[PDB]
Amino acid sequence: TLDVFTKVVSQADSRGEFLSNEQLDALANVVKEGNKRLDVVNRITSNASAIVTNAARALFEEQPQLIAPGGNAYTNRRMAACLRDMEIILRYVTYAILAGDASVLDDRCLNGLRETYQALGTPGSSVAVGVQKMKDAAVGIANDPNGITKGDCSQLISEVASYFDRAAAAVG
Amino acid sequence: TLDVFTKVVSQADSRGEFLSNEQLDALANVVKEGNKRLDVVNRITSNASAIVTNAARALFEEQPQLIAPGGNAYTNRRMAACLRDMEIILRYVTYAILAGDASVLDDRCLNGLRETYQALGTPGSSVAVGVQKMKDAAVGIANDPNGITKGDCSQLISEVASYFDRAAAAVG
Amino acid sequence: TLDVFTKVVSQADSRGEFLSNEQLDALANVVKEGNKRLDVVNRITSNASAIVTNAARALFEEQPQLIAPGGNAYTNRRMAACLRDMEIILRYVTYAILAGDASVLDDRCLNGLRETYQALGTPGSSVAVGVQKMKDAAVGIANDPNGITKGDCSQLISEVASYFDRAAAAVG
Amino acid sequence: TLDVFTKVVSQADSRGEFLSNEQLDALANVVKEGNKRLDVVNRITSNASAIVTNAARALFEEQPQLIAPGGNAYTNRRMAACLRDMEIILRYVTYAILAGDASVLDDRCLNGLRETYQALGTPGSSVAVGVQKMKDAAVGIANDPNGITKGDCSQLISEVASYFDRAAAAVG
Amino acid sequence: SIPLLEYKPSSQNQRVPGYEVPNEDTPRIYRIEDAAYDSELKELIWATYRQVFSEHVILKFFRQGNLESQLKNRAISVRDFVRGLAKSEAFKTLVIKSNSNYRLVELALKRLLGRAPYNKDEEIAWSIKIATNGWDGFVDALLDSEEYQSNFGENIVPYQRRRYKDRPFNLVTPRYGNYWRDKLESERYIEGDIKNFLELAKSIEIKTVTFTP
Amino acid sequence: VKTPITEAIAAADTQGRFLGNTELQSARGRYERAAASLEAARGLTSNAQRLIDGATQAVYQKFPYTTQTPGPQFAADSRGKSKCARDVGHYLRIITYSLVAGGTGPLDEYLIAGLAEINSTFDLSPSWYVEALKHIKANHGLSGQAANEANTYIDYAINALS
Amino acid sequence: VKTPITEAIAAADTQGRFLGNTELQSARGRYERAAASLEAARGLTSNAQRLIDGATQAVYQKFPYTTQTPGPQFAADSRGKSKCARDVGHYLRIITYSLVAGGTGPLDEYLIAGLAEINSTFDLSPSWYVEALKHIKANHGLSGQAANEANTYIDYAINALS
Amino acid sequence: VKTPITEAIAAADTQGRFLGNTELQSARGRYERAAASLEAARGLTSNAQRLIDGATQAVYQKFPYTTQTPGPQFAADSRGKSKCARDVGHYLRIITYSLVAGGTGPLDEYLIAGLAEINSTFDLSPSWYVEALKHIKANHGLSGQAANEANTYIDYAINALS
Amino acid sequence: VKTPITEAIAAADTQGRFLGNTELQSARGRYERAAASLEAARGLTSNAQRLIDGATQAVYQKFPYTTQTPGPQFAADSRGKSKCARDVGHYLRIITYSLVAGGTGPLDEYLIAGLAEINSTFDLSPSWYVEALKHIKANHGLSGQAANEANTYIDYAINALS
Numbered sequence A, B, C, D: 001t002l003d004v005f006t007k008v009v010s011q012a013d014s015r016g017e018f019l020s021n022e023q024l025d026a027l028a029n030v031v032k033e034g035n036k037r038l039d040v041v042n043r044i045t046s047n048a049s050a051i052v053t054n055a056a057r058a059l060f061e062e063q064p065q066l067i068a069p070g071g072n073a074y075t076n077r078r079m080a081a082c083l084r085d086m087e088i089i090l091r092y093v094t095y096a097i098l099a100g101d102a103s104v105l106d107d108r109c110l111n112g113l114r115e116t117y118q119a120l121g122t123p124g125s126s127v128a129v130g131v132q133k134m135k136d137a138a139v140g141i142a143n144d145p146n147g148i149t150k151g152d153c154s155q156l157i158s159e160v161a162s163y164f165d166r167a168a169a170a171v172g
Numbered sequence E: 001s002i003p004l005l006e007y008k009p010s011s012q013n014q015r016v017p018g019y020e021v022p023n024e025d026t027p028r029i030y031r032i033e034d035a036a037y038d039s040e041l042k043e044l045i046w047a048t049y050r051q052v053f054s055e056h057v058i059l060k061f062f063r064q065g066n067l068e069s070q071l072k073n074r075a076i077s078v079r080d081f082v083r084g085l086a087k088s089e090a091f092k093t094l095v096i097k098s099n100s101n102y103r104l105v106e107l108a109l110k111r112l113l114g115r116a117p118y119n120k121d122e123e124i125a126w127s128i129k130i131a132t133n134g135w136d137g138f139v140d141a142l143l144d145s146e147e148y149q150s151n152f153g154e155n156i157v158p159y160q161r162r163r164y165k166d167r168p169f170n171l172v173t174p175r176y177g178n179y180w181r182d183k184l185e186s187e188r189y190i191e192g193d194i195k196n197f198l199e200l201a202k203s204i205e206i207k208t209v210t211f212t213p
Numbered sequence F, G, H, I: 001v002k003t004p005i006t007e008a009i010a011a012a013d014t015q016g017r018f019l020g021n022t023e024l025q026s027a028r029g030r031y032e033r034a035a036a037s038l039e040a041a042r043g044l045t046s047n048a049q050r051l052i053d054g055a056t057q058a059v060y061q062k063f064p065y066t067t068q069t070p071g072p073q074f075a076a077d078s079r080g081k082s083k084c085a086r087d088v089g090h091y092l093r094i095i096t097y098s099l100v101a102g103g104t105g106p107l108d109e110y111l112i113a114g115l116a117e118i119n120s121t122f123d124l125s126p127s128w129y130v131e132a133l134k135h136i137k138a139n140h141g142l143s144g145q146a147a148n149e150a151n152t153y154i155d156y157a158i159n160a161l162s
Ligand SMILES: *[C@H](C)[C@H]1/C(=C/c2[nH]c(/C=C3N=C(/C=C4\NC(=O)C(CC)=C4C)C(C)=C\3CCC(=O)O)c(CCC(=O)O)c2C)NC(=O)[C@@H]1C
Pocket: A066, A072, A073, A077, A078, A079, A080, A081, A082, A083, A085, A088, A108, A109, A113, A116, A120, A122, A123, A126, A127, A130, E005, E101, E124, E125, E126, E127, E128, E129, E131
């Protein structure tokens, strides 16, 4: 579990030299964009369950053979395995957005997902679509201004689109 | 956990015959050298903590990159690993000297040390060198006569130098 | 584990009515004195180990029969039981100062201390004296201004002197 | 778990003074009677299973209702519970003979036997009689000289008769 | 909520009865109710550190003062005491930051249950519960398992059940995994490299002019 | 209950150590958040009779069958509608409780624990109270940062219903 | 296996500490005991053919039916009596093993573990080998301290049979 | 490592729930604390040479025997004094690490874990580094709220030494 | 406490079996060791006032600053030197206890348990008592026999200090 701060700490730690002024200035900018980071993380967990069901219907339409019999997500028990585990991507993504680093995302939700499926028979291709259907809706939920002050966070939202693309490409 | 006695017992059990006369003649000699075995083992454990620190300084001088940052023994927790651990070689060596057999040394302190380091990143060669710095001091502690009766134990001290060389060569 | 806030919550839950206006006026004052509460709690844990040893010497002078042989705190082991357990009063006191309520102090460090000593045989009065010794030094550490902004902590300070007096009188 | 030696040690620790000369004179006598203590302890465990069955038949004759249906030791399962147990008195008695102290006997085999029977329904008299039928046979086994050197151990055998009488009277 | 993934069990030294009547190289498996002393409880409190953490990580700072006191008092059952060490955030930083989810199954079976895992498919089976229930909830389901409560019983320190010719588990399994080691080599700080000057080289602006004749 | 003051306390308890600067910074994050949250609670307590009247009528117009279908579970009789204003009158207390406490403690301990457990038994559809809270989410009338903070506890209850 | 040398080793291993004077005094108790035990083993190895002939004939005279009753378990045929001298010839090895090792290790690991387990299956009565060992107990001919040392392991095997 | 951001993360992980407003308020408390803590780290990094020269000379004048007594553990030879500035030069890194991280994580993971474990072995008295840090505590020269922030981690290390 | 008699007892207790010849040989190793040990304890009890006077003066000449430095921890005042002869007078009791008991039991239970725990708090350097015991190791006057057994306990205490 690493931060943006402890990323710089463990990098400066190996050298054995105190952190440079330029590096510190960069971390002072993270303090200024710190309140926008709580704007984006609070907006996802408020719309957490609404974006799980909405990405599930768009997945199970466009691959109909899954809930069809013989499919990997056919019975009501496996179906709940998949439907509820779509939160576990979002659980570890919004950890990484609030952390600002992809270390927590890597060793919990990324380290064995491409591992565990060969023994399970769950298709790799299906996973790529589903998380990639979360990404265009999770970015779109945090994009629109309604009752918040207007700011610019395109340099910060691209981190969120990178986090889902890190989660997608490590499996499929 | 085997002795010199149960070494002969389990060997004589496999042939299924009675214990031969010269085997009892050889074990009667181990009774006569039994009091020399007690003194040597006792001496090591009296100088146990003094030979851990003294072999540690000679190791961490001659490989300075270990306690230097980035090294495997840099931080204190890791450092209290490589230092305290050095007793665990001596814990299982002086077991084997008092046992007179290398069976207790093999299945506890030798059976997975060359195993456990590939997953750990600890350098096997460095550890081997450290044990070889124990050996010339552990032999030298038991060699010198001060306030004990003079005897001859060169046929017994060579067993101790064999035990460290068994512990060293099985790792590096 | 209760707060000042959840004290009002669990009290307003029992009547089953909404939170009244003056209760929110009182809790708004706790927000204003919230930064003084972090002033007092941070000053104790910085001087935690210095006030354990200093209250121990004043205890073991003025009751010399304890570390004298036959005493309850004679041997090195028991002596470490009491010396280190004097932190456990301070561990649960500074919990209660930062909580602002004596509920955490009551069910961990107060609920069985007057219980456990009869079986143990430890003198209740001696422990009580030690607690008193801490109180006049813990108040005196948080009282003096050196390099902090001038402020009135009299209201806050009394609560701390009440917490040690709650811890003292429940045992002796 | 206490000795005769650590009995004197923990008693001399409470007074906090050095070990007196007559205490070392008394413990030197325990060294001289130490070889007779191994004579008596080795004779019981060699006749351990023979004295369990022999004391069982004399118990279950003279109280026939235990064997008879409705009795506490009727079924083959409970019967083994009692039979198996009669070793556990002898297991903790011969510990106490070799220890020379009744501390090991007290906190394992004596501390809850009179406790555990009210919840179990096992009668007190049956247990008391059985222990007392062991005692006159365990003393009689260690008394007779056959192929050992003659000595005097009446001051030592009375300790064994005290140990069974300690085990008997604490239950019934 | 959902019932666990069904796993096939393999053949394992403890799964069956074995007719060893007490062998010497077998552990001294301790009990709380024997003690009656100052003395016995210091050895018993040390062997449970030696099981769940390991000998190397048995340092004083990690140890908890409150938990040790409880055992002497006897307020908490040793089985309730091991819950303190498994849900200790001093323990949690050492093992959960450094180990993946499937290794977290294996390490908890190898230490707390004192058994080797049967197969690979059952570390997958226990894995779903840990992510949802947390680390504490997976430990809580392991200690309240019927298998743990019957064989260790209520007050007996964890140990390895059957090891006729089997590796000690502390030696057998590293505190951390093979994955987290590869990160430590990746962030070693190589000296004299071209890679640490790559983020400086892109900041320098260079203009090049080529002439053709 | 869960409070980011007591969250700092119970975390430092399991490690058995003093309140360092790690747990101390969690306190002032709760403190200055209250000043945007206490008048977020004052906006709900002043408008108490408006919202429970508003959300109850919003449920009937969203689901017109719940006033007509005969059953105890529904609001056909008078004691159903008497139990209607009791239920949404019970929701607004905990939201004002969890705004004042500053955490999701009272929402955990008093509302959502076993909330999916009872609704299977009494066949109360959770989508009834989803539309009830969404009327409160749009008509609570609060403005500014404080209003936004409150907005989360309404959405935290909705995700617990679903 | 169990040996009071290795008993001192395995006890110091679980505590994780060095060989103090507690474990060290257990060694010389084993050492000077061997000098009264090694010629206790020499008294049995020299008289090997006497005792297995003596104990086998002592069993037949004690139990006269075991030579007459037809069955594999009994000694009616020749291969029964061939398996007779094998069994008591196997007992005298372990007694000489456990005398030389100085502990009840080889008696534990090689004889009595599962000894009550097999005799229920093959209906070999353990009272057969009780009278077999009791002939060896009286006919060993050992004298002095050595006899005492060789006498316990015979009695330790008898209590394991019963 | 321990950080009041990750303290909010690891607490919400064991309950298996989303980042509510309980864990979210712990973040801001870390954020606005950094602005009084980052220039608290800039006061130490600019004065790096001064303090390790100051604390090392303060140790020798406090304990005059540590320059004269012959031993590896002491500073009689040159390589002792070379290892002197290495040690206090290693303390000031972690204080600047734990000020920048905002928690006692790097002080836990890199300094005080096993710190009382090694000092028993190498007979390094911890009261040496107590007086070393107390010189840094008085000579830092920091002022205001930021100074207070740099003052706790010095005192948190002292209580870990004792 | 730990005694190689009770070491044989507690080992046979966990297996739930009788005192075989494995545990029995551990007893006579303790018994004939006492002859050397008992005399070895008589050499220390007769010379009680010599050694605590000798070791205390040896500490002051080794560390000359401990008589001059002002502090409770040191021996500047009279009650420090009164607590000086109490401490080394307390060491010689346990060595005579652990020689008479024949094991490291009383050294474990009464001296070294929590000995590294208190010395971090009261800043008592363990190297003070190292030189104190090393004076007793050279000036106890016992040579051979029990003294060798006696000396180990001096060296067992030194390794526990370090
Ligand atoms: C979803 C888009 C696809 C899918 C999901 C699915 N998975 C399973 C079974 C498991 N899923 C996991 C996943 C994880 N475990 C972890 O620890 C983490 C990180 C915290 C993750 C992401 C595991 C271990 C399993 C095994 C069983 C378990 O739940 O504990 C199922 C159920 C399948 C079954 O029961 O056989 C489903 C439905 N499968 C699909 O069909 C989608 C394509």
